Structure formats: structure tokens, C-alpha cells
């Protein structure tokens, strides 16, 4: 038993994380197969383009640990940088590019100068920010889920918003909301809790016999998200009702009842007690999440 | 900025998890050079030496992936079986067997039938349990912490208490606290609140922007002792206090001013707000946590 923020295992990405040196600035890249994706802005309310075509090759410095990889050529795909290397990494994993839906939960591996510094669990907020945990140096780390022995890379750092959390892109270039790489005002977007996460928290919760927050009250998803309006919560659709029909079903909760438990928390609070060791609703666990703590689901 | 329950980077340990079993037990067991390390209840109020004198090397198998070792000698340290095989790990790291303190934390790689399935952040808490999130088939998994390219192993599972809490050994097979790998009445002993980490995360927070808990008061370690008591707060030693000296220093925030903030909070509640996104003050960050990830410490 028992419940914990846990990261996937780190192994198979810790081997494609390289340095990347442009002139003056160090940041981090994902070399998979013979090319390296770095962020763009390593080549600087700029112009990339007029900034790249701009570049040669030999100005990019690639260290895989103690070992100089020489570009071959370079693209810029969005707000990545693919630079083409004259070695495939022999550490390149079975990998996807996906790119995420707010709500949804990723491994992030925290790189500085290509050197794996830790590895934590983080959500992509419904405002597309995700509260990490970056420095200078940090860019090019990537977020990441392993689906049984493949990687799903969904994001690369790019940069903080003045609120401390962080923004950056999918693999494929592409920022997750409406950030974008220039030094310009940029606001988050106020953030909302992501509901069908707290309720899958809860299941977690019962699971591991955490029952103090229960009742025999039931609602309909109608007036539930009303109070959920309120309490500045996602609304809960009937399809985030089926997802956590599993949860529902172990516990033989109903997932409208559990609803009215959680209505009924928002509208007390929790009164001292804990759930799950934590004194806040948490919303950074999927209801997959959940099933694969709550039933050990592994990866070779 | 930021801050996260940040796991070390799992590599150099996933690279030493095979799968243990003998008769109708399998559990995980690490494999460093040529010695596979994992919990001797596999053999399983009994008495393990009757038990081990007993079988013989080919009653264990020791699945590594798809690749069956032959073990050709073992022996029992404490609580732990060391199984001698015909071959020496290719993965082996640089590697330390140590044991930790109470109050320290590492990372532990969720481990079943050999295959990592996740990593947290765990510490030892007072009463030497740790509140990990462990299921059947967990066991053998290990704690561990990195430095430079040195791992520590410092943690192997083996086994739950009815609270829902966790017990194992140091790599060498000592039980950490009074528990013993027998199914026998055992009680985790009363926790306390390990105060020089609940510093050092206060110290976090304030090198992240958060100031809402520090007021203009000072107190002397004595007399802050008094209500760590109350609360069920280990004493802070002098020896935490020079431990909290960087943080102290780069925050400019002297540790007793911190301690008559934590006093203060003990004595009022957070009232509402939060610091680093919890409602609970935290203790498991050591001060050498904050320090790493406030300053981004890697590992080749
Ligand atoms: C990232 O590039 C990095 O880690 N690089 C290290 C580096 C070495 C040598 C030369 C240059 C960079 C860095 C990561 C940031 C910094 C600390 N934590 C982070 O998330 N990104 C970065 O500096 C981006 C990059 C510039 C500005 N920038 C920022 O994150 C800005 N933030 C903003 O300006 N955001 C606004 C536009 C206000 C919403 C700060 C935090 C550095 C000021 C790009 C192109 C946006
Ligand atoms: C551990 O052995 C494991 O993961 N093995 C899987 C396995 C496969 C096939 C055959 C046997 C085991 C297992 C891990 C536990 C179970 C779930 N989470 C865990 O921490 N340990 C385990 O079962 C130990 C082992 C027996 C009893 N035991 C327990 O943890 C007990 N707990 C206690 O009995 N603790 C007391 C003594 C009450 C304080 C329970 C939880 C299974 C009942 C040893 C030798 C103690």
C-alpha cells in the first residue's frame, strides 16, 4: 500500500541527454537516432529564421558526455532545433513524439550542461503551464511517459513565466499554450484544479483505506458542476465519468457518489485531516496514475 | 525556480534489478558484479537458517530481462540472502552499501518480478519506517541516493506495517528499526516531525519568492525546543543549525529567526495559505535537498 508522486523510471532517457553549446549559451539536447533536439533559442524579440540561416554547423558544440558530436546539418521545426549529428545514439530507445492534453501527467528529467540532475511527476495545468522545477541551465530537459517499453517524449523546457511556473513545447516544436520563445510580456492565464485528477486521487485514497472524506450523499454531474464552478474546478464531463469507471469499480464507490464527496470537501474543506498525507485536494494524479500505483504496472 | 519531491535519476539502478524466485516466492533482488542481494524471507516465525542450510543453489532461479543466472554459492547476511552467480553484472556501477540516519532522504525504485516501475523521494522518518507505496511483488526494491556517479544503496523493502507504513534493511541486511522478518506482532512506534527538514523547505520556500510565514521575532534554540516538543517536533540540535547554515546564508535569514517563523506557524496554522504548494509543512527535504535542487546539482 500506500501512495506516492512517482516518476517513471529515468534510464532509457538519461541516455539520450546531451549538451548543447551555440556561442554563448549552454543548454540541454535529446539526441535520438542521429539527430539532436535542442530549443531553438540556443542560437541566441528575435528573428530565428534570420538567426539560423545564419548559423554553419561547426557552430554548434554537442558534447554526449566526453565525446564531441559533429553536426551534419540543421532544421528548425517550431521552436526546436534538429541538428543533424554524424553518430546515432546507441542508447536510442523505442520512443514516440505525442503531444499532451492539459490534465495529463509526464516525468520530467531534469538536465543541466547534458548531466541528469533528478527526476519528478508533473501535470500539464489546464493554462498549458506546468509547475516544475527548473534553473538556469535547464532548457532542453524533457517531460516523458514510458508505455511499456516506449518512451512518449511530450516536452522540452523552454522557459519560466514571472509566477514561477514553466512553459515549453512538444518534441515537434510546439509550445504548449500561448507562450512563445521571446523575452516579451507573457501571462500564465488563470489556472483552474483539474477535477477528474482529485477524484482519481480520492479512489487512490480509498484504495489505500483512506476513508474520512465519504458519505451517503450522491449528485447528479449537473449540480456537482455548479459547485465546481465555484470552487474554480474543471467541469466534469460524462467521459471523464467513464475513465474513472475502473476506480469506481474497485472500490464499488459510484462515481457520482464520490462526487458528493467531493462537493462536500470543497464546501467544508477537509477540518484538519489529511488525505493521502496531504492537507490540498491533489489534482496532479490521472486516474491511470492511480491504477498503475494502486496495481504495480511495470516496464522492461 | 520551482520546487519538487525530486527523485535521483534511476539509471544506474535499473541497470541491477533481477527477479528472485524460489519455490513459490519471487520477489526483486539486485545484482551488483557477480552477487545478487534480496531479502531472505524468498527461502519462506521461522528460522532462516534451518530454512537456507537447506536448499540448494538450484532452488533459485534469477531471471535478468530474458536471461536465466545460475547461482553457484550463497550465504545470509542479517536479513538478506546473497546469492553468488556465474556472472558479473556488465551494468554495475560505482557503488556504495551505506545506512542512513533518520531524517535523511532517497530515492527508491519500485521494483516487480524485476521490471522498475517507478521512483519517488522517501524518507527515513523518526520511528524507522518510511511511507513508501510498495504492493505484493515489491519486495527487493531498493532506496538509494547518488553522488557524482556513486550510488548509495541505503534500502531494501521487505515488508509492511499495519498502518500502511513500510520496514526494511540497509543493504547489508540490518533491519532499520526494531522490525524483524517474521509475521509477528510489531507497532511502528510513535512518529515525530523531523524539524531540520521542515527548516531547510521553509529555506526553499524562501529562495522561491514564497515569504508569507516570516515575521520580524527571534527565539532562542531553547526556548523554540519548547514547543517543538509540544508539537511533536524532533529537538533541533545545534548541529541542524550549522547543517542550516548555507540556506541561512543565502536567504539572509539567520536559523532562528526561521525557527521563531516555524514557531509561529506551529502556533497559528498556515490560516488558508500554503508554501510550495502543500497546506502541511514538509519535512522530507534534508537540507542537502534544497541545496541540490536550489543550485541544480547533475550526475555523469
Ligand atoms: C533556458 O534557456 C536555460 O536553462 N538556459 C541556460 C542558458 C545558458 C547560457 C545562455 C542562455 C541560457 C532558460 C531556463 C529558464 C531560466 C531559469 N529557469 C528557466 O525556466 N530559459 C530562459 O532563460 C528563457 C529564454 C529567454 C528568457 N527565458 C526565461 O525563462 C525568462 N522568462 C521570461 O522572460 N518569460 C517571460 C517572457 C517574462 C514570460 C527569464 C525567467 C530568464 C526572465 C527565452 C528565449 C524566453
Ligand atoms: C514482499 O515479500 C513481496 O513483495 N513479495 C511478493 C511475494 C511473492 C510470492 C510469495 C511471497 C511474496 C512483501 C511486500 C509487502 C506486501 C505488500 N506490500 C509489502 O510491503 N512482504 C511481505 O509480504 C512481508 C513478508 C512476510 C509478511 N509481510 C508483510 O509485509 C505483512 N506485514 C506484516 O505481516 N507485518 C507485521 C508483522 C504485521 C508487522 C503483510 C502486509 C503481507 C501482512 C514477511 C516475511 C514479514
Same mark, same amino acid.
Given at each position: 500500500?500506500?501512495?506516492?508522486?512517482?516518476?517513471? *523510471?529515468?534510464? #532509457?532517457?538519461?541516455?539520450?541527454?546531451?549538451?548543447?553549446?551555440?556561442?554563448?549559451?549552454?543548454?540541454?539536447?535529446? =539526441?535520438?537516432?542521429?539527430?539532436?533536439?535542442?530549443?531553438?533559442?540556443?542560437?541566441?524579440?528575435?528573428?530565428?529564421?534570420?538567426?539560423?540561416?545564419? #548559423?554553419?554547423?561547426?557552430?554548434?558544440?554537442?558534447?554526449?558526455?566526453? &565525446?564531441?558530436?559533429?553536426?551534419?546539418?540543421?532544421?528548425?521545426?517550431?521552436?526546436?532545433?534538429?541538428? #543533424?549529428?554524424?553518430?546515432?545514439?546507441?542508447?536510442? *530507445?523505442?520512443? #514516440?513524439?505525442?503531444?499532451?492534453?492539459?490534465?495529463?501527467?509526464?516525468?520530467?528529467?531534469?538536465?543541466?550542461?547534458?548531466?541528469?540532475?533528478?527526476?519528478?511527476?508533473?501535470?500539464?495545468?489546464?493554462?498549458?503551464?506546468?509547475?516544475?522545477?527548473?534553473?538556469?541551465?535547464?532548457?532542453?530537459? &524533457?517531460?516523458?511517459?514510458?508505455?511499456?517499453?516506449?518512451?512518449?517524449?511530450?516536452?522540452?523546457?523552454?522557459?519560466?513565466?514571472?509566477?514561477?511556473?514553466?512553459?515549453?513545447?512538444?518534441?515537434?516544436? $510546439?509550445?504548449?499554450? *500561448?507562450?512563445?520563445?521571446?523575452?516579451?510580456?507573457?501571462?500564465?492565464?488563470?489556472?483552474?484544479?483539474?477535477? &477528474?485528477?482529485?477524484?482519481? =486521487?480520492?479512489?487512490?485514497?480509498?484504495?489505500?483505506?483512506?476513508? =474520512?472524506?465519504?458519505?451517503?450523499?450522491?449528485?447528479?454531474? $449537473?449540480?456537482?458542476?455548479?459547485?465546481?464552478?465555484?470552487?474554480?474546478?474543471?467541469?466534469?464531463?460524462?467521459?471523464?465519468?467513464?475513465?474513472?469507471?475502473?476506480?469506481?469499480?474497485?472500490?464499488?464507490?459510484?462515481?457520482?457518489?464520490?462526487?458528493?464527496?467531493?462537493?462536500?470537501?470543497?464546501?467544508?474543506?477537509? $477540518?484538519?485531516?489529511?488525505?493521502?498525507?496531504?492537507?490540498?485536494?491533489?489534482?496532479?494524479?490521472?486516474?491511470?496514475?492511480?491504477?498503475?500505483?494502486?496495481?504495480?504496472?511495470?516496464?522492461?
Amino acid at each position: 500500500s500506500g501512495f506516492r508522486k512517482m516518476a517513471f *523510471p529515468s534510464g #532509457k532517457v538519461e541516455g539520450c541527454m546531451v549538451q548543447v553549446t551555440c556561442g554563448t549559451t549552454t543548454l540541454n539536447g535529446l =539526441w535520438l537516432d542521429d539527430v539532436v533536439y535542442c530549443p531553438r533559442h540556443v542560437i541566441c524579440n528575435p528573428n530565428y529564421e534570420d538567426l539560423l540561416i545564419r #548559423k554553419s554547423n561547426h557552430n554548434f558544440l554537442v558534447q554526449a558526455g566526453n &565525446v564531441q558530436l559533429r553536426v551534419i546539418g540543421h532544421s528548425m521545426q517550431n521552436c526546436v532545433l534538429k541538428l #543533424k549529428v554524424d553518430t546515432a545514439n546507441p542508447k536510442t *530507445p523505442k520512443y #514516440k513524439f505525442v503531444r499532451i492534453q492539459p490534465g495529463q501527467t509526464f516525468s520530467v528529467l531534469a538536465c543541466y550542461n547534458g548531466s541528469p540532475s533528478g527526476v519528478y511527476q508533473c501535470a500539464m495545468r489546464p493554462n498549458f503551464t506546468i509547475k516544475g522545477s527548473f534553473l538556469n541551465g535547464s532548457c532542453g530537459s &524533457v517531460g516523458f511517459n514510458i508505455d511499456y517499453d516506449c518512451v512518449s517524449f511530450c516536452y522540452m523546457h523552454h522557459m519560466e513565466l514571472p509566477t514561477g511556473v514553466h512553459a515549453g513545447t512538444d518534441l515537434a516544436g $510546439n509550445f504548449y499554450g *500561448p507562450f512563445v520563445d521571446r523575452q516579451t510580456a507573457q501571462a500564465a492565464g488563470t489556472d483552474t484544479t483539474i477535477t &477528474v485528477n482529485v477524484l482519481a =486521487w480520492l479512489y487512490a485514497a480509498v484504495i489505500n483505506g483512506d476513508r =474520512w472524506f465519504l458519505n451517503r450523499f450522491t449528485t447528479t454531474l $449537473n449540480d456537482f458542476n455548479l459547485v465546481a464552478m465555484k470552487y474554480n474546478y474543471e467541469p466534469l464531463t460524462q467521459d471523464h465519468v467513464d475513465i474513472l469507471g475502473p476506480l469506481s469499480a474497485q472500490t464499488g464507490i459510484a462515481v457520482l457518489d464520490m462526487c458528493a464527496s467531493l462537493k462536500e470537501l470543497l464546501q467544508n474543506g477537509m $477540518n484538519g485531516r489529511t488525505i493521502l498525507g496531504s492537507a490540498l485536494l491533489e489534482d496532479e494524479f490521472t486516474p491511470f496514475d492511480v491504477v498503475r500505483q494502486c496495481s504495480g504496472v511495470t516496464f522492461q
